[PDB]
Design a protein around this ligand. Structure first.
Ligand SMILES: *[C@@H]1O[C@H](CO)[C@@H](O[C@@H]2O[C@H](CO)[C@@H](O[C@H]3O[C@H](CO)[C@@H](O)[C@H](O)[C@@H]3O)[C@H](O)[C@H]2NC(C)=O)[C@H](O)[C@H]1NC(C)=O
Ligand SMILES: *[C@@H]1O[C@H](CO)[C@@H](O[C@@H]2O[C@H](CO)[C@@H](O)[C@H](O)[C@H]2NC(C)=O)[C@H](O)[C@H]1NC(C)=O
Ligand SMILES: *[C@@H]1O[C@H](CO)[C@@H](O[C@@H]2O[C@H](CO)[C@@H](O)[C@H](O)[C@H]2NC(C)=O)[C@H](O)[C@H]1NC(C)=O
Ligand SMILES: *[C@@H]1O[C@H](CO)[C@@H](O[C@@H]2O[C@H](CO)[C@@H](O)[C@H](O)[C@H]2NC(C)=O)[C@H](O)[C@H]1NC(C)=O
Ligand code: NAG
Ligand code: NAG
Ligand code: MAN
Ligand code: MAN
Ligand code: GLA
Ligand code: GLA
Lengths: 391, 390
């Protein structure tokens, strides 16, 4: 989308995977979807390093709206869970120097059953602009047909542009087109800063694998449409939560960096381990994700329960990720010709290789003709930065 | 098995899940199956408090044997990877106050394809006892028929008795019987100190879930037969490895306690996190697994993506485990009437509940009319001990 936004993948926090549609503020106050949840996450994004590391957009997902429209036809916040409106929360979030994301649905209802935007695009985009919304997540539930799906996704893009306001536009359009038919990603890049391709993540190694294998399988159709302004969205970061091992958490961080994925943490910043945090705020791995060339990486080799992915970076540099997909035994030896990586270009006549993950380690100079030997933890990934060098 | 052994579930360390069949000692000398790997783990079991915690048996799984038998018919350890022989390793493990296990197969070959004990049960048992082996894990690959399987598990059990040496007898009999017929557990118990029921464990939460699910599914068949001398074996503890979150590791520790399961770590003792060491060595939780009454716990309740398991314990105590099986969201609220726990008698008229897992915390007194409420992490478990007030 040519609105000047998401020149690198958007970065922030989204309530959905960790908080879901918890409406019960009486018995579950600490996890209900409430204005005070958002206000507290906003304070920690600032005091805990998050906004410094580039996490900028604090985003509301589904279940913030009142059961129906006001007597002017406009959406509203829940009166009990968000008594101060969206506009006061936006000021609050903006005062911390952060940006505010909201949620709506292209059809007659949102996914959880709240007011949809069909027949309301212009009114809502405007409403979002008058509130100070800075990103919109646009879901696709309860939609008549593909014709309406495309019409409505295209309409809202124009409506938001037509507001005057810089509002990052995040679509689940390819997801819901999937499939009556294969998405046309050029049409979508024209309308969307980023797009959900595949099924909702949850807090599992299963879910992670399935997204990698989905993308891996479908990379010839999706990797080249991504670049500054429009990204493929493999869904939220779930580091900090419960279902992933440390090694599976490095797999998720390493590969969302390779995929040039937006980075929306969905977790509880009040209760996150020091190692989850160091990982999420890893400056060298974020720099990869945020690399300004903005070409998405891809899967280079698959076999023998190993994968090799690599991303091209600015300045003739490359990120390389090796995955061990064998979930028995221990760290497995993997060796490859340095000439095989980065299209023979990294490492001609040499590259300096530094391991970023699972730990940060300067590894030596490697000549074009050199071999890299590594060892990879079951379900873990090894993440490497190759710097091209005169040598 | 009325051999005086396994009066509480066996505790030790077993190489297979983490080290598998690595025969490559030139390129990976520190992780191949060699006498060295065993020596390292044996001194760490002593120096890092494993043995104080009750981990006693250091056990060799498959891939130790030389490719053929000696001129007199006896199994032999592999001459390059085990140059000193199994007896000397046994001498050595004994010196540290530990006991040594070894591994063989009922059939013609071991699962990796090394010499089986079929036709050699009497000589193999005697060879083992001659070496100072304190435990045999006996696997069921490469076996003709259900007859031979039963004949060989029975025969070996009797060869061992007759050495006059105490040797824990670990059996994979039931596992190899499914899907041909339902095993006779009353019979198995008579010949075995413990028995594997289900597929080999992985470094994965999928694997653990599927062991839990299999056990809770067949619990009517297996729970009551367990007790001092004879245990269901849900396979190795994998805590300390690569594939389980903290919360999944607690689940495995808690559930293996409720199930009165042998506790065989399969992990790298040389490289294990502090958190994973405190779990595996959690005194209060090992005390549950090791309860001298030896009645296996079971699943009480399953619903709305929660499970409740409970185990009866010495002295009118119970253990209760609450698992959250929903893989999305945050900690989720579970409530149950304490009248429903412990057959209605833990907590009549009252009980003191103390949470043990994920963190130790005294919770207070609960009248018979009370409800226990907890928040349970996705893939986590809360483990409680309940003391009846009397
Ligand atoms: C070969 O088989 C024998 C029986 O199948 C087994 O004998 C059993 O040995 C244990 C030794 O601990 C005895 O137990 C202890 O048991 C007495 C009486 O039951 C208790 O009061 C005490 O706790 C005591 O410590 C069993 O009683 C005994 N059972 C029988 C039927 O004799 C042998 O040990 C086996 N031999 C070998 C070397 O495996
Ligand atoms: C409304 O849409 C227009 C059309 O794309 C956007 O204008 C583009 O903005 C970037 C900003 O740097 C320029 O590089 C392009 O040249 C612009 N396109 C055109 C047609 O010149 C405009 O920014 C949008 N406004 C909002 C509020 O999103
Ligand atoms: C939202 O609601 C209305 C009402 O059901 C839908 O509009 C109808 O759509 C049918 C099917 O194409 C049309 O032929 C009718 O003229 C409409 N009927 C009514 C009662 O108005 C609309 O399709 C729904 N929108 C979405 C996005 O699914
Ligand atoms: C997918 O959609 C895009 C844009 O909607 C198509 O590209 C446009 O096609 C028109 C008509 O042929 C051209 O005149 C324009 O130059 C194109 N616009 C853009 C933004 O590139 C694209 O060809 C479609 N692919 C398929 C298979 O339909
Ligand atoms: C499965 C099977 O048929 N088993 C055969 C058996 O018939 C034969 O008599 C025996 C003696 O060596 O060898 C084996
Ligand atoms: C081992 O193989 C032989 C010869 O083929 C056969 O006699 C016997 O049944 C086998 N043993 C078992 C238990 O399968
Ligand atoms: O000329 C139009 C102009 O718009 C503004 C900038 O974003 C430039 O990239 C572009 O050239
Ligand atoms: O796209 C690159 C270029 O676009 C235009 C301007 O807004 C520049 O500041 C920007 O760097
Ligand atoms: O209801 C909210 C929920 O709905 C859709 O399914 C999206 O794909 C999810 O990421 C989340 O927004
Ligand atoms: O090859 C050895 C391997 O054999 C079988 O698969 C057992 O069930 C495993 O625990 C292990 O001993």
């Amino acid at each position: 989308l040519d609105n000047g936004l998401a020149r690198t993948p958007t970065m922030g926090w989204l309530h959905w995977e960790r908080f879901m549609c918890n409406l019960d503020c009486q018995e579950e106050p600490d996890s209900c979807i409430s204005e005070k949840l958002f206000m507290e996450m906003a304070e920690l994004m600032v005091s805990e390093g998050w906004k410094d590391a580039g996490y900028e957009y604090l985003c509301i997902d589904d279940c913030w709206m009142a059961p129906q429209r006001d007597s002017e036809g406009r959406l509203q916040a829940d009166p009990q869970r968000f008594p101060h409106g969206i506009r006061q929360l936006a000021n609050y979030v903006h005062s911390k120097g952060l940006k505010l994301g909201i949620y709506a649905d292209v059809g007659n209802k949102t996914c959880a059953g709240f007011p949809g935007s069909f027949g309301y695009y212009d009114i809502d985009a405007q409403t979002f602009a008058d509130w100070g919304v800075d990103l919109l997540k646009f879901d696709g539930c309860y939609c008549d047909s593909l014709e309406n799906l495309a019409d409505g996704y295209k309409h809202m893009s124009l409506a938001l542009n037509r507001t005057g306001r810089s509002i990052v536009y995040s679509c689940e359009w390819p997801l819901y087109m999937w499939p009556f038919q294969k998405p046309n990603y050029t049409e979508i890049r024209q309308y969307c800063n980023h797009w959900r391709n595949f099924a909702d993540i949850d807090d599992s190694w299963k879910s992670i694998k399935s997204i990698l294998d989905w993308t891996s399988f479908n990379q010839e159709r999706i990797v080249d449409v991504a670049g500054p302004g429009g990204w493929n969205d493999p869904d939220m970061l779930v580091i900090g939560n419960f279902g992933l091992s440390w090694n599976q958490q490095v797999t998720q961080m390493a590969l969302w960096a390779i995929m040039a994925a937006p980075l929306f943490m969905s977790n509880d910043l009040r209760h996150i381990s020091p190692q989850a945090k160091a990982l999420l705020q890893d400056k060298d791995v974020i720099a990869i994700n945020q690399d300004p060339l903005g070409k998405q990486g891809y899967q280079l080799r698959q076999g023998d329960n190993f994968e090799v992915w690599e991303r091209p970076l600015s300045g003739l540099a490359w990120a390389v990720a090796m995955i061990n997909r064998q979930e028995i035994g221990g760290p497995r030896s993997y060796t490859i010709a340095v000439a095989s990586l980065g299209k023979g270009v990294a490492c001609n006549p040499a590259c300096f290789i530094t391991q970023l993950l699972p730990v940060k380690r300067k590894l030596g100079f490697y000549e074009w003709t050199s071999r890299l030997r590594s060892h990879i933890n079951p379900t873990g990934t090894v993440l490497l930065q190759l710097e091209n060098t005169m040598q």
